[PDB]
Write a protein that binds this ligand. Structure first.
Ligand code: NA
Lengths: 28, 10, 249
Protein backbone atom coordinates (compact mmCIF):
# COMPACT_ATOMS: atom_id res chain seq x y z
CA UNK A 1 0.00 0.00 0.00
CA UNK A 2 1.52 3.26 -1.32
CA UNK A 3 -0.45 5.27 1.20
CA UNK A 4 -0.10 2.96 4.23
CA UNK A 5 0.62 4.30 7.73
CA UNK A 6 -0.42 7.92 7.05
CA UNK A 7 -3.56 8.92 9.01
CA UNK A 8 -6.14 11.18 7.22
CA UNK A 9 -6.88 13.15 10.41
CA UNK A 10 -3.27 13.46 11.64
CA UNK A 11 -0.28 13.09 9.22
CA UNK A 12 -2.35 13.97 6.18
CA UNK A 13 -3.47 17.14 8.01
CA UNK A 14 -0.06 17.89 9.61
CA UNK A 15 -1.70 17.39 13.01
CA UNK A 16 -0.16 15.42 15.83
CA UNK A 17 -1.87 13.09 18.27
CA UNK A 18 -1.39 13.60 22.01
CA UNK A 19 1.28 10.94 22.70
CA UNK A 20 3.29 10.54 19.47
CA UNK A 21 6.11 12.89 20.59
CA UNK A 22 6.68 10.41 23.41
CA UNK A 23 7.38 7.76 20.75
CA UNK A 24 9.60 9.95 18.59
CA UNK A 25 11.63 11.08 21.62
CA UNK A 26 12.41 7.46 22.69
CA UNK A 27 14.09 6.95 19.31
CA UNK A 28 17.41 8.15 20.75
CA UNK B 1 0.47 -26.02 27.76
CA UNK B 2 1.43 -22.39 28.42
CA UNK B 3 -0.59 -22.23 31.66
CA UNK B 4 1.90 -24.73 33.12
CA UNK B 5 4.28 -21.76 33.01
CA UNK B 6 1.70 -19.34 34.47
CA UNK B 7 0.89 -17.82 31.02
CA UNK B 8 -2.45 -16.93 29.51
CA UNK B 9 -2.74 -16.23 25.71
CA UNK B 10 -4.19 -12.77 25.05
CA UNK C 1 -5.02 -2.26 27.96
CA UNK C 2 -3.91 -1.54 31.50
CA UNK C 3 -2.81 2.03 32.32
CA UNK C 4 -3.64 3.30 28.88
CA UNK C 5 -5.72 6.26 27.85
CA UNK C 6 -8.66 6.94 25.52
CA UNK C 7 -7.70 7.04 21.90
CA UNK C 8 -8.50 10.10 19.85
CA UNK C 9 -10.75 9.79 16.82
CA UNK C 10 -8.91 8.54 13.75
CA UNK C 11 -5.76 7.88 15.95
CA UNK C 12 -5.57 4.22 15.00
CA UNK C 13 -7.54 3.90 11.66
CA UNK C 14 -6.07 0.46 11.13
CA UNK C 15 -7.84 -0.88 14.26
CA UNK C 16 -10.02 -3.91 13.59
CA UNK C 17 -12.40 -5.71 16.00
CA UNK C 18 -12.83 -9.50 15.73
CA UNK C 19 -16.33 -10.62 16.78
CA UNK C 20 -18.12 -13.89 17.32
CA UNK C 21 -21.54 -13.59 15.62
CA UNK C 22 -23.63 -15.75 17.94
CA UNK C 23 -23.49 -15.17 20.90
CA UNK C 24 -22.25 -11.71 19.91
CA UNK C 25 -18.89 -11.35 21.59
CA UNK C 26 -15.80 -9.16 21.06
CA UNK C 27 -13.09 -11.81 20.87
CA UNK C 28 -9.87 -9.96 19.96
CA UNK C 29 -8.28 -7.06 18.18
CA UNK C 30 -6.79 -7.09 14.73
CA UNK C 31 -5.33 -4.70 12.15
CA UNK C 32 -6.09 -3.69 8.61
CA UNK C 33 -3.12 -4.16 6.22
CA UNK C 34 -4.94 -3.54 2.90
CA UNK C 35 -8.59 -3.04 1.82
CA UNK C 36 -9.17 -6.80 2.16
CA UNK C 37 -6.47 -8.22 4.47
CA UNK C 38 -6.58 -8.29 8.25
CA UNK C 39 -3.96 -9.49 10.66
CA UNK C 40 -4.66 -10.99 14.14
CA UNK C 41 -3.22 -13.47 16.69
CA UNK C 42 -3.78 -17.15 15.69
CA UNK C 43 -4.96 -18.08 19.25
CA UNK C 44 -8.03 -15.84 18.74
CA UNK C 45 -9.14 -18.35 16.09
CA UNK C 46 -7.45 -21.58 17.23
CA UNK C 47 -6.57 -22.56 20.74
CA UNK C 48 -7.44 -26.23 21.46
CA UNK C 49 -6.81 -26.17 25.34
CA UNK C 50 -9.86 -23.89 25.47
CA UNK C 51 -11.67 -25.83 22.69
CA UNK C 52 -11.32 -22.75 20.48
CA UNK C 53 -11.59 -23.39 16.76
CA UNK C 54 -13.49 -20.69 14.92
CA UNK C 55 -14.27 -20.95 11.27
CA UNK C 56 -14.95 -18.09 8.82
CA UNK C 57 -18.75 -18.24 9.20
CA UNK C 58 -18.61 -17.93 13.00
CA UNK C 59 -16.99 -14.52 12.77
CA UNK C 60 -17.09 -10.95 11.60
CA UNK C 61 -14.88 -7.88 11.76
CA UNK C 62 -15.83 -4.27 12.66
CA UNK C 63 -13.57 -1.50 11.32
CA UNK C 64 -13.46 2.25 12.03
CA UNK C 65 -14.80 2.13 15.61
CA UNK C 66 -13.90 4.52 18.39
CA UNK C 67 -16.45 3.61 21.03
CA UNK C 68 -18.57 0.69 22.05
CA UNK C 69 -21.18 2.97 23.68
CA UNK C 70 -22.97 3.24 20.30
CA UNK C 71 -23.25 2.37 16.65
CA UNK C 72 -21.08 4.85 14.77
CA UNK C 73 -23.38 5.46 11.87
CA UNK C 74 -21.76 6.38 8.51
CA UNK C 75 -18.35 5.73 10.18
CA UNK C 76 -17.90 2.06 11.25
CA UNK C 77 -17.90 -0.73 8.69
CA UNK C 78 -18.31 -4.44 8.78
CA UNK C 79 -17.20 -7.45 6.83
CA UNK C 80 -17.58 -11.17 6.72
CA UNK C 81 -14.49 -13.33 6.32
CA UNK C 82 -13.77 -15.09 3.07
CA UNK C 83 -10.85 -17.09 4.36
CA UNK C 84 -8.74 -17.62 7.47
CA UNK C 85 -5.02 -18.46 7.22
CA UNK C 86 -3.25 -19.58 10.38
CA UNK C 87 0.54 -19.98 10.36
CA UNK C 88 1.39 -23.66 9.49
CA UNK C 89 3.97 -23.72 12.27
CA UNK C 90 1.87 -21.95 14.99
CA UNK C 91 2.82 -23.63 18.25
CA UNK C 92 -0.11 -23.26 20.61
CA UNK C 93 1.07 -26.12 22.83
CA UNK C 94 4.56 -25.05 23.87
CA UNK C 95 5.10 -21.32 23.65
CA UNK C 96 2.60 -19.65 21.26
CA UNK C 97 5.32 -19.33 18.63
CA UNK C 98 4.07 -17.80 15.36
CA UNK C 99 0.88 -16.53 16.94
CA UNK C 100 -0.35 -15.01 13.73
CA UNK C 101 -3.21 -15.35 11.33
CA UNK C 102 -4.41 -13.60 8.23
CA UNK C 103 -8.10 -12.99 7.41
CA UNK C 104 -9.28 -12.28 3.88
CA UNK C 105 -12.34 -10.04 3.83
CA UNK C 106 -15.41 -11.02 1.73
CA UNK C 107 -15.93 -7.42 0.77
CA UNK C 108 -13.09 -4.85 0.69
CA UNK C 109 -13.57 -1.94 3.05
CA UNK C 110 -13.62 1.58 1.68
CA UNK C 111 -10.92 3.73 3.22
CA UNK C 112 -11.93 6.89 5.04
CA UNK C 113 -10.68 9.28 7.73
CA UNK C 114 -11.51 6.51 10.21
CA UNK C 115 -10.33 3.52 8.17
CA UNK C 116 -6.77 3.32 6.78
CA UNK C 117 -4.15 0.47 6.47
CA UNK C 118 -0.93 0.36 8.52
CA UNK C 119 2.42 -0.48 6.90
CA UNK C 120 4.29 -3.71 7.32
CA UNK C 121 7.97 -3.10 8.30
CA UNK C 122 10.76 -3.14 5.75
CA UNK C 123 14.44 -4.08 6.44
CA UNK C 124 15.33 -0.53 7.46
CA UNK C 125 12.42 -0.02 9.90
CA UNK C 126 13.01 -3.42 11.55
CA UNK C 127 16.82 -3.02 11.90
CA UNK C 128 16.51 0.64 13.05
CA UNK C 129 13.45 0.71 15.31
CA UNK C 130 13.41 -2.73 16.91
CA UNK C 131 15.67 -1.82 19.76
CA UNK C 132 15.41 -1.82 23.52
CA UNK C 133 14.13 1.45 24.92
CA UNK C 134 12.42 2.52 21.69
CA UNK C 135 8.69 2.88 22.34
CA UNK C 136 5.79 1.47 20.45
CA UNK C 137 2.06 1.88 20.81
CA UNK C 138 -0.44 -0.82 21.78
CA UNK C 139 -4.20 -0.43 21.19
CA UNK C 140 -7.32 -2.40 22.20
CA UNK C 141 -10.68 -2.85 23.86
CA UNK C 142 -9.42 -5.63 26.20
CA UNK C 143 -9.47 -5.69 30.01
CA UNK C 144 -8.56 -2.58 31.87
CA UNK C 145 -7.05 -4.59 34.75
CA UNK C 146 -5.80 -8.11 35.37
CA UNK C 147 -8.25 -8.77 38.20
CA UNK C 148 -14.10 -4.05 33.40
CA UNK C 149 -13.69 -3.43 29.67
CA UNK C 150 -13.65 0.11 28.08
CA UNK C 151 -16.18 1.70 25.77
CA UNK C 152 -13.54 3.89 24.09
CA UNK C 153 -10.49 2.27 22.40
CA UNK C 154 -7.54 2.31 24.75
CA UNK C 155 -3.98 3.30 23.85
CA UNK C 156 -0.67 2.74 25.73
CA UNK C 157 2.92 3.47 24.66
CA UNK C 158 5.49 0.89 25.82
CA UNK C 159 9.33 0.50 25.31
CA UNK C 160 10.78 -2.60 23.71
CA UNK C 161 12.74 -4.61 26.31
CA UNK C 162 16.18 -6.22 25.84
CA UNK C 163 15.90 -9.92 24.99
CA UNK C 164 17.91 -11.27 28.06
CA UNK C 165 15.56 -9.30 30.32
CA UNK C 166 12.57 -10.79 28.37
CA UNK C 167 14.06 -14.29 28.63
CA UNK C 168 14.69 -14.18 32.40
CA UNK C 169 11.21 -12.73 33.12
CA UNK C 170 9.48 -15.84 31.81
CA UNK C 171 9.62 -19.62 32.04
CA UNK C 172 8.32 -19.88 28.45
CA UNK C 173 10.88 -20.94 25.85
CA UNK C 174 10.74 -17.67 23.92
CA UNK C 175 11.79 -17.57 20.27
CA UNK C 176 12.86 -14.96 17.69
CA UNK C 177 9.28 -14.79 16.37
CA UNK C 178 8.31 -12.90 19.50
CA UNK C 179 9.50 -9.85 21.45
CA UNK C 180 8.58 -8.23 24.73
CA UNK C 181 7.74 -4.69 25.70
CA UNK C 182 6.87 -2.89 28.92
CA UNK C 183 8.37 -0.82 31.71
CA UNK C 184 10.68 -2.36 34.25
CA UNK C 185 9.79 -2.20 38.02
CA UNK C 186 12.56 0.42 38.60
CA UNK C 187 11.15 2.58 35.80
CA UNK C 188 8.91 5.60 35.98
CA UNK C 189 5.78 4.32 34.18
CA UNK C 190 3.76 1.12 33.70
CA UNK C 191 1.10 -0.39 31.40
CA UNK C 192 0.46 -3.50 29.41
CA UNK C 193 -1.93 -5.22 27.08
CA UNK C 194 -4.37 -7.62 28.77
CA UNK C 195 -7.18 -10.14 28.12
CA UNK C 196 -9.12 -9.36 24.95
CA UNK C 197 -6.22 -7.33 23.46
CA UNK C 198 -4.65 -10.13 21.36
CA UNK C 199 -4.40 -9.56 17.63
CA UNK C 200 -4.20 -5.78 18.28
CA UNK C 201 -1.17 -3.93 16.76
CA UNK C 202 2.10 -2.87 18.35
CA UNK C 203 2.89 0.06 16.07
CA UNK C 204 5.83 2.46 15.63
CA UNK C 205 5.96 5.84 13.87
CA UNK C 206 9.06 5.94 11.66
CA UNK C 207 11.10 9.17 12.17
CA UNK C 208 12.47 8.61 8.67
CA UNK C 209 9.25 8.91 6.61
CA UNK C 210 6.57 9.65 9.24
CA UNK C 211 4.61 6.43 8.52
CA UNK C 212 3.17 4.09 11.07
CA UNK C 213 4.52 0.55 10.88
CA UNK C 214 3.11 -2.50 12.63
CA UNK C 215 5.99 -4.20 14.40
CA UNK C 216 4.08 -6.65 16.64
CA UNK C 217 0.77 -8.38 17.43
CA UNK C 218 -0.46 -8.68 21.10
CA UNK C 219 0.10 -12.32 21.97
CA UNK C 220 0.66 -13.39 25.64
CA UNK C 221 1.68 -12.57 29.16
CA UNK C 222 1.75 -13.68 32.80
CA UNK C 223 -1.27 -11.82 34.06
CA UNK C 224 -1.34 -8.13 33.14
CA UNK C 225 0.91 -5.26 34.18
CA UNK C 226 2.80 -7.19 36.86
CA UNK C 227 6.09 -5.80 38.15
CA UNK C 228 8.95 -7.68 36.57
CA UNK C 229 6.68 -9.18 33.87
CA UNK C 230 6.42 -8.06 30.26
CA UNK C 231 3.85 -8.35 27.43
CA UNK C 232 4.92 -10.58 24.55
CA UNK C 233 4.21 -9.77 20.96
CA UNK C 234 4.38 -11.70 17.66
CA UNK C 235 7.33 -10.37 15.63
CA UNK C 236 5.75 -9.13 12.39
CA UNK C 237 8.95 -8.57 10.46
CA UNK C 238 10.17 -12.17 11.14
CA UNK C 239 6.95 -13.56 9.67
CA UNK C 240 6.67 -11.07 6.82
CA UNK C 241 7.56 -13.62 4.11
CA UNK C 242 4.62 -15.79 5.23
CA UNK C 243 2.30 -12.76 5.17
CA UNK C 244 3.42 -11.91 1.64
CA UNK C 245 3.23 -15.54 0.44
CA UNK C 246 -0.42 -15.87 1.65
CA UNK C 247 -1.45 -12.50 0.21
CA UNK C 248 0.35 -13.25 -3.09
CA UNK C 249 -1.27 -16.73 -3.47
NA1 NA D 1 5.31 -5.39 33.94
Amino acid sequence: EADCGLRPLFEKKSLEDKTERELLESYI
Amino acid sequence: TVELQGVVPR
Amino acid sequence: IVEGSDAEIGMSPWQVMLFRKSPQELLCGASLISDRWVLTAAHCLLYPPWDKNFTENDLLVRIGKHSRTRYERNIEKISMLEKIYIHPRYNWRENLDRDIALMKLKKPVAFSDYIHPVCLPDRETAASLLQAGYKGRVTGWGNLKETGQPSVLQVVNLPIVERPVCKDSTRIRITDNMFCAGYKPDEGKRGDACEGDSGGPFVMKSPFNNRWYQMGIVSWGEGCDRDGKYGFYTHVFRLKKWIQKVIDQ
